[PDB]
Design a protein around this ligand. Structure first.
Ligand SMILES: CCc1ccc(S(N)(=O)=O)cc1
Ligand SMILES: CCc1ccc(S(N)(=O)=O)cc1
Lengths: 169, 169
């Protein structure tokens, strides 16, 4: 609950398990990491009064996914923008001090109504925590993805849980 | 509608635009390609009588996503299994002979209730086409992801569209 913004170096330390500690929530390392900075995190406010994250990803034409997705038709995979929203809900649970490894549990409705081209400058994730539940610790959230000011994706009911050292599916 | 099974080499040709032709549906190239083979495709049968795909991904411990997702806690990203299901609905539309580039438009409910560990042998995608619509050509489908016989993910209302040479969001 202490730090309210995170640099790329903080997120890389998070990917190594060195932000929240071993066995606690981790962000992916490159090349699955789809966040450069967390600009804002709070446990109050947001759309539901249960907290909020704002995060950013810098875009340049040399990002790996543009070359393979698709050849002659470069576009950021929608699945990776959706993934960033799950990863941020996991980061939220770890930031609150809960123990365990993050797992995405699913989502209600996802809509893609725009795309991230290699000319774009910045993707912004807005995450609104809707509820946190305690057999598992889990969070439910809504999220949007925007590119250069324009909303392009929405997700309702993102669900992420934490799995202690004994938890399996 | 001609070939009913596809090898990895066919899917790589598809990723180059050389299966359905330039400007038509493409699978991603490595490292976003999450399918090794299409074992079965039909435009009849399936759960809704509007067609079916069965596809497979071989798992081994050296797949790139295990090293970065997560360090000390390797698990196939759920977003990439979900992505394979969108990519197969796109492949279906191209296989029917429709023109245009594929874009995922979203999904109804997604559930993850299992995980793909680096000890697993094979992921299987089962896609049931629910409806195809003609301003855009689009398909709606349900899908499951299974690992070594065990169902682990479900998606209802996967939605994929085709964008001609003039189409934007
Ligand atoms: C070719 C169909 C298609 C197109 C784009 C995606 S995306 N952008 O990975 O979610 C998935 C599937
Ligand atoms: C750490 C939270 C988390 C855990 C796993 C995923 S997944 N497997 O990329 O969909 C996403 C987010």
């Amino acid at each position: 609950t202490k730090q309210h913004a995170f640099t790329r170096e903080d997120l890389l330390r998070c990917s190594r398990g060195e932000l929240f500690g071993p066995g606690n929530a981790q962000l992916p390392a490159p090349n699955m990491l789809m966040i450069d900075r967390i600009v804002h995190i709070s446990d109050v406010g947001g759309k539901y009064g249960k907290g909020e994250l704002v995060a950013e990803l810098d875009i340049n034409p040399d990002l790996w996914f543009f070359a393979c997705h698709f050849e002659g038709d470069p576009v950021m995979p929608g699945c990776l923008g959706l993934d960033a929203m799950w990863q941020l809900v996991g980061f939220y649970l770890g930031w609150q001090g809960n123990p365990g490894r993050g797992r995405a549990l699913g989502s209600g409705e996802v809509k893609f109504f725009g795309q991230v081209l290699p000319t774009a400058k910045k993707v912004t994730y807005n995450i609104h925590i809707k509820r946190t539940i305690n057999s598992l610790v889990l969070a439910i959230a809504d999220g949007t993805v925007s590119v250069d000011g324009r909303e392009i994706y929405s997700a309702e009911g993102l669900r992420v849980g934490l799995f202690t050292s004994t938890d399996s599916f």
